[PDB]
Design a protein around this ligand. Structure first.
Ligand SMILES: C[S@@+](CC[C@H](N)C(=O)[O-])C[C@H]1O[C@@H](n2cnc3c(N)ncnc32)[C@H](O)[C@@H]1O
Ligand SMILES: C[S@@+](CC[C@H](N)C(=O)[O-])C[C@H]1O[C@@H](n2cnc3c(N)ncnc32)[C@H](O)[C@@H]1O
Lengths: 278, 278
């Protein structure tokens, strides 16, 4: 629990959110409410999502007796389990532990929000904006960039929090692509997971792993049962996989150097041959 | 004019060529025709390229009146200035002084051939096939390997030639990659040359040289002129180069131990930031 305490950084974060007076703002991790009290003056409603019941009670107390108190709803509990309401904008200062699952939750949330202004550890922020093959380019980079426009807005020193964290922080903007690309995110993430796990291995090597071959063969057999496709007696899932890698040109490539165009082509090429990822 | 005169090595070279009866064989440097007369019996056509008109005249005489004479075409002159016809396989024994230009001629030749079996000086051969970082791993190794598969096939003692060369020799196989990487060679070689000057020192030391910083700043300014990108007054090429090396993880890497995909990645990292080596 690192409380953002520098008023200038808080004001800049709120400015970057470009609030409208009619906005519902989702605030995740309100801490002691340093940002909440300012958000409440600028928006129609603030929905603060907070894990710790003590910090919930104290937030209610902080706004008690003020003209804006009635514009605050506090949702108690783990945000990752919460069914999130409609919101226009999100500001968030969450622990590093939940940064990844929260980004994915945001990317799939409906109805679409307009933007999110988020505080993350520096490395996590750099990963979100990394290009092919930066050292920090990973599943997080490509999944975020597929579904959203993501920008690194500002560096924030550890000195700005109480108590200070051990690493520097960053403010990032995430604006979800609306409509999103016409791509099944579950399939996409299956392919991305498999190829990035060892992002430095060629795809040929990545797909040779027993765990990979076993699931892909199982799902392919299910596929064929649905679509009435004969599987020869001498079927080899290794050969089937390798011929797709060859035909798409990605066999000798490594996920760390592959962009969105590349993975879309690869996914298309697996799908055309009956391989569908979970 | 070192003429190969060991029939067993001649037989072994022809064997490694894996001739098909329908093949057109380019033989560069046929000498006295020791290999030519054997090639003619196994291939559809032999196109022999020879610089010395005296040897050309003797080669015609050697096949004269034999049943395979009509399958021989002799192209007279410098093979480097010769527009080469289609050929399936190539066999070559040329002076050491033109090994490098001839290799890159073959690699740029279209349509693609299937394989070349070539005689080189020992050290030249060891450089072609060197792996990151064998002692002899160099610009020649990586430039050749970018475009071809290369194998050292056999050592050839100087006594096998008349007259003998001053050095030991090797037989190498070259098979062009088809398709090749879609990399502009002048661009690629710009990066390769720079980094291989001191192949045992790091990339950040290679990129700190005055002349290199001047080149890259000049090229970035050209890219920015093309795209109408404004360059701030306080622009630092040193800083921009360092950020790219840090982003990609290459600051402390050395050309002697970098493979092809390493160079592709580094080149992409510069090019995507507007910095070109051509
Ligand atoms: C004080 S911030 C720490 C983040 C840090 N400043 C950083 O660099 O990003 C953590 C806040 O989020 C709350 N929080 C932690 N986990 C949560 C969760 N799963 N759901 C909702 N709120 C949570 C904490 O109780 C606290 O209010
Ligand atoms: C190159 S010489 C010497 C080869 C020697 N065994 C070696 O490894 O260096 C063998 C043949 O190549 C011919 N030759 C030399 N330069 C040539 C060129 N530029 N184009 C075509 N043939 C050439 C010579 O006349 C001779 O017939």
């Amino acid at each position: 629990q690192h409380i953002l305490k520098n008023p200038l950084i808080i004001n800049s974060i709120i400015d970057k959110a470009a609030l409208r007076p009619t906005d519902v703002v989702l605030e995740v991790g309100p801490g002691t409410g340093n940002m909440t009290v300012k958000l409440l003056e600028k928006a129609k409603k603030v929905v603060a999502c907070e894990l710790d019941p003590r910090l919930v009670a104290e937030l209610h107390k902080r706004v008690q007796g003020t003209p804006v108190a009635s514009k605050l709803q506090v949702l108690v509990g783990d945000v990752l389990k919460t069914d999130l309401p409609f919101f226009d904008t999100c500001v968030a200062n969450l622990p590093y532990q939940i940064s990844s699952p929260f980004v994915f939750k945001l990317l799939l949330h409906r109805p679409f929000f307009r933007c999110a202004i988020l505080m993350f550890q520096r490395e996590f922020a750099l990963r979100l904006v990394a290009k092919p093959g930066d050292k920090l380019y990973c599943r997080l980079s490509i999944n975020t960039q597929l579904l959203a426009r993501v920008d690194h807005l500002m560096k924030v020193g550890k000195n700005n929090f109480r108590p200070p964290p051990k690493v520097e922080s960053s403010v990032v903007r995430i604006e979800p692509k609306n409509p999103p690309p016409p791509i099944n995110f579950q399939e996409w993430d299956g392919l991305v997971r498999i190829t990035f796990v060892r992002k430095n291995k060629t795809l040929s090597a990545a797909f040779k792993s027993s765990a990979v071959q076993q699931l892909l063969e199982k799902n392919y057999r299910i596929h064929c049962s649905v679509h009435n496709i004969i599987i020869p007696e001498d079927f080899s899932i290794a050969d089937k996989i390798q011929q797709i890698l060859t035909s798409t040109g990605f066999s000798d490539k490594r996920a760390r150097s592959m962009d969105i165009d590349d993975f879309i082509r690869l996914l298309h090429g697996f799908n055309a041959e009956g391989i569908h990822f979970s």
